[PDB]
Amino acid sequence: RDNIQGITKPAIRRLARRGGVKRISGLIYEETRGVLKVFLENVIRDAVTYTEHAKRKTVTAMDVVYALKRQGRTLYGFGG
């Protein structure tokens, strides 16, 4: 299950272009994939811990907001 490869190169190019980059080297993609993997790992671990404490089986939208707020990355507009 190598689903990390689903983040195609043109998507990363679009993200960089919105960021304001004009020229991109050929080795940025692996670094970007690693960074995204680490970030998702941390956030999802916190959300799953909240869900486990709540004694449920489906993670809701609220505990994702709580996990994001814990790391000082508050999010607006999703029922906070």
Partner 1 sequence: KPHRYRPGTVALREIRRYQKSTELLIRKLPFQRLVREIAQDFKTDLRFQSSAVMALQEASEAYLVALFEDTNLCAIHAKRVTIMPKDIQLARRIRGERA
Partner 2 sequence: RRKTRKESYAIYVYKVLKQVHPDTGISSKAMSIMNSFVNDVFERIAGEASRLAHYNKRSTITSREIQTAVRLLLPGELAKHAVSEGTKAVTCYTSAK
Partner 3 sequence: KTRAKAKTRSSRAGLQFPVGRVHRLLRKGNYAERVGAGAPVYLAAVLEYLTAEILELAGNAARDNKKTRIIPRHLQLAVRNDEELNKLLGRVTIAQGGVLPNIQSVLLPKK
Partner DNA sequence: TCGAGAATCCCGGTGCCGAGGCCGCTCAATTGGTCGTAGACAGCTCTAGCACCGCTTAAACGCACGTACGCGCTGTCCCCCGCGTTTTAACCGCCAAGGGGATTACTCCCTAGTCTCCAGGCACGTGTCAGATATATACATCCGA
Partner DNA sequence: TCGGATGTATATATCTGACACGTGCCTGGAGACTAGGGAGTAATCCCCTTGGCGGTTAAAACGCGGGGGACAGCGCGTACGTGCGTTTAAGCGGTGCTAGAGCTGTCTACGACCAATTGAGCGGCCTCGGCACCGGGATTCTCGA
50 is an interface residue for partner 1 by CB under 8 A: no
Residue type at 64?
V
- The secondary structure of residue 78, as a DSSP letter, is S
- 59 in contact with partner 1 (CB under 8 A): yes
Is the Cβ of residue 19 or residue 77 nearer to partner 2 in the bound state?
77
**Interaction with partner 3 in 4-43: which residues (CB under 8 A)?**
18-20, 22
Alpha carbon 70 to its chain's center: 15
Number of Cβ within 10 Å of residue 27's Cβ equals: 7
Measured CA to CA, the distance from residue 58 to residue 31 in angstroms comes to: 32
Our CB check for DNA shows the closer of 40 and 71 to be: 40
Q: Please give the structure tokens belonging to residue 11.
A: 């998507």
Give the per-residue contact string, 29-58, with DNA (x = CB under 7 A; - = no): ---------------------------xxx
- Residues making contact with partner 3 (CB under 8 A): 18-20, 22, 72-78
